[PDB]
């Protein structure tokens, strides 16, 4: 947690349905965005931060929250945008001898700024006489080692926490979600909406051969009459449904 890894995610589509088998028993409580509508959403910036903290310390990963993890290990900004994911890892991060390999910063001169990492190993001076490299009384190592106790409750068990930070510009987007597709229906009056282009008409097979870069099709009236399907590269004719005046 003190030396938390930072990862960049971009130029890809984010699939959130996979995060049930890889991370069972996960908590998706988060801030800044509705969790449900993340599938049809576009992210321009994505940061990933992952580490392991104790069960009682999972609540400390929240904006405006103070504590041992927050002040000395990982601080979240007040205006944090993005979501965090945490799931138990007792089957993976618990050893019969002891999970002594995970360390956290315990003594620190001042509270960490948001999104900051501290890897210093200098001996902390908590008194008046300088330590001078001695770790005796009033001179404690700033880093302590987790001693996970699976025998106790989940608060003394290794919790794997992955912190995701976004910005949600949805204009120069580089991370988005699969927009899915619909069973094309042809030769009938249809309410269609292609990439935000909502309209009503009869969708028929089109003989036009407009170029690969060329997407839409316009007419003399400056209205869209030909369209190419985003799901399948095919040419469609948009014709207004049969109409006329009655006398």
């Amino acid at each position, epitope marked *: 947690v*003190y*030396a*938390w*890894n*930072r990862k960049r995610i971009s130029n890809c589509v984010a699939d959130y349905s996979v995060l049930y088998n890889l991370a069972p028993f996960f908590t998706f409580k988060c801030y800044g965005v509705s969790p449900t509508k993340l599938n049809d959403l576009c992210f321009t910036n994505v940061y990933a931060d992952s580490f392991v903290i104790r069960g009682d310390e999972v609540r400390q990963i929240a904006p405006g929250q103070t504590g041992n993890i927050a002040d000395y290990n990982y601080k979240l900004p007040d205006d944090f945008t993005g979501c965090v994911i945490a799931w138990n890892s007792n089957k993976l991060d618990s*050893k*019969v*001898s002891g999970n*002594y*390999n*995970y*360390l956290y910063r315990l003594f620190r001169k001042s509270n960490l700024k948001p999104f900051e*990492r501290d*890897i210093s*190993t200098e001996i902390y001076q908590a008194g008046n006489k300088p330590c001078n490299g001695v770790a005796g009384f009033n001179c404690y190592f700033p*880093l302590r*080692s987790y001693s996970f106790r699976p025998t106790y409750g989940v608060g003394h068990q290794p919790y794997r926490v992955v912190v995701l930070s976004f910005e949600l510009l949805h204009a120069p987007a580089t991370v988005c979600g699969p927009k899915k597709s619909t069973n094309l229906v042809k030769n009938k009056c249809v309410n269609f909406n292609f990439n935000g282009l909502k309209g009503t008409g009869v969708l028929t097979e089109s003989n036009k051969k407009f170029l690969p870069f060329q997407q839409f099709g316009r007419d003399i009236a400056d209205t869209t009459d030909a369209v190419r399907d985003p799901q399948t590269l095919e040419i469609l004719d948009i014709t207004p449904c049969s109409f006329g005046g009655v006398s």
Partner: antibody
Amino acid sequence: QSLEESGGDLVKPGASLTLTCTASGFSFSSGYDMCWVRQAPGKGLEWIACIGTGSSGNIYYASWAKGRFTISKTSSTTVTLQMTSLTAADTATYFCARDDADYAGPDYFNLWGPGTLVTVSS
Amino acid sequence: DIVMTQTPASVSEPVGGTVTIKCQASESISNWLAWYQQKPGQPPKLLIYAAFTLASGVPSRFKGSGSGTQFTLTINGVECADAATYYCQQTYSSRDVDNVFGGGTEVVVKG
């Protein structure tokens, strides 16, 4: 505990050899991992391939040791390594690394065996 | 995936002198790193596991500093018997790695 090696002798190029790591005083438990390393006579250590001593062997290989070598467990206190198409550069001193944590890969090695020397000549 | 280098290749300090060996990784390995030292004709032994915790039976002079990508081992004192080669292991991600162990760095103590 000891992890004395076996099966080390002069071998012709393009041949096969069977190196055996035998444990003494303990058995290959599931919770703790074992690995295999070798040391060239002139340069530093290297990792080639090894398998876990658990119920489901999480066998792991190196990039330059992708398919030439083969490691398997034959008994609770006997593990063997098989390599084929041996070349001139394969001569080294082979050690039987003993890991301390079963994180699906070589973690901190607390114990090593005395090791064996395998050389190639014609 | 992770490529690790150990520098300097050769070091030489007086018996009362201090020498430092730094171990650098291509990307961040957090806290996962170990230090190994072998004498000629002898397999290496673990010295500094987790890059900070000292081993058993080893003098306190052996230590560890740095985290993430750069790890440094500082030798406070030699006694003409610690002249050997030091290696660092990534012990972080070994899915497809040519060698977890780092480069060789022998120490020469001029007594």
